[PDB]
Amino acid sequence: LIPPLINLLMSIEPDVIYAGHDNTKPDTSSSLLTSLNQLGERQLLSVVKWSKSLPGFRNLHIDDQITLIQYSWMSLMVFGLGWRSYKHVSGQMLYFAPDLILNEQRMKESSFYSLCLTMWQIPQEFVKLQVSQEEFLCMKVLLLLNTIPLEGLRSQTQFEEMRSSYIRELIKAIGLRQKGVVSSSQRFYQLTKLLDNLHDLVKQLHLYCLNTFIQSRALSVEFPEMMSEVIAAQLPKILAGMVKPLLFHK
Numbered sequence: 001l002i003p004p005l006i007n008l009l010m011s012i013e014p015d016v017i018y019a020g021h022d023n024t025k026p027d028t029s030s031s032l033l034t035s036l037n038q039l040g041e042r043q044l045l046s047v048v049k050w051s052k053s054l055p056g057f058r059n060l061h062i063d064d065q066i067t068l069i070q071y072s073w074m075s076l077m078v079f080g081l082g083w084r085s086y087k088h089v090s091g092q093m094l095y096f097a098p099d100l101i102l103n104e105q106r107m108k109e110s111s112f113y114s115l116c117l118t119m120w121q122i123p124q125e126f127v128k129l130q131v132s133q134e135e136f137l138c139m140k141v142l143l144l145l146n147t148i149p150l151e152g153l154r155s156q157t158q159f160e161e162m163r164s165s166y167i168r169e170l171i172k173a174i175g176l177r178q179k180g181v182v183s184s185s186q187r188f189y190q191l192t193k194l195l196d197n198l199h200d201l202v203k204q205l206h207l208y209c210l211n212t213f214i215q216s217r218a219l220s221v222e223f224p225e226m227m228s229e230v231i232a233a234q235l236p237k238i239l240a241g242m243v244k245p246l247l248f249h250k
């Protein structure tokens with residue numbers, strides 16, 4: 001049967017979020033980018049609500065919670081995109097929302113084809129490894145807890161206990177399907193290395209994000225309130241590597 005913390009993680013998963021995109025008019029760079037940022041804002045709000053329901057998280061210092069959301073939102077948003085894309089369109093379109101779906105031809109015709117390809121790796125990776133919903137749920141929690149400040153957190157001990165608990169739960173998620181010691185330990189190496197590898201992909205999204213933010217008036221791409229806050233709060237510091245990426249393997 002499904003381990004209860006994994007069953008809890010499924011009950012608190014954010015519900016479907018609509019981008020609000022007018023599909024009756026042709027695509028332009030600004031309309032698409034604006035819709036994606038608006039979707040971004042709504043998804044960020046749902047990450048915050050999710051984190052308040054996420055066992056352990058509310059028990060960290062309030063400054064730590066904020067910092068970890070500010071550090072990880074981009075990883076969580078693209079991991080989420082990867083999963084929706086995998087689950088609804090077999091990983092072969094980018095499923096940002098039910099009303100905002102980009103097949104490859106729509107990607108090609110956008111003003112950000114390369115960004116689309118970069119983001120598209122993630123669902124292609126889920127397809128390859130046949131990632132379970134239970135694995136996915138646990139790995140997503142680990143992304144929230146995957147970077148800390150160079151000086152550490154105010155609630156460092158509590159944080160380590162929480163992170164260690166979800167690592168243990170990921171191992172149980174793996175145990176549901178992969179029977180055998182050698183297959184399960186190799187599976188744990190694969191999934192955790194995928195998380196290590198995300199840091200690089202995310203860094204490219206962070207740079208693109210910062211460049212777009214700087215240039216937002218020229219591009220006609222608005223950045224809503226909470227998104228503007230998390231970018232201004234931490235993004236240069238993150239790009240600079242003035243944080244501590246947690247790694248599973250050297």
Ligand SMILES: Cc1noc(C)c1S(=O)(=O)N[C@H](C)c1ccc(-c2cc(F)cnc2Cl)cc1
Nearest residue numbers: 033036037039040077078081119205208209212
């Ligand atoms: C890239 C990127 N990621 O987040 C933000 C914000 C950016 S950005 O380049 O500053 N803005 C553009 C419009 C943008 C591009 C992609 C996404 C985005 C990315 C993602 F992986 C899952 N969902 C969404 Cl809505 C959200 C916004």
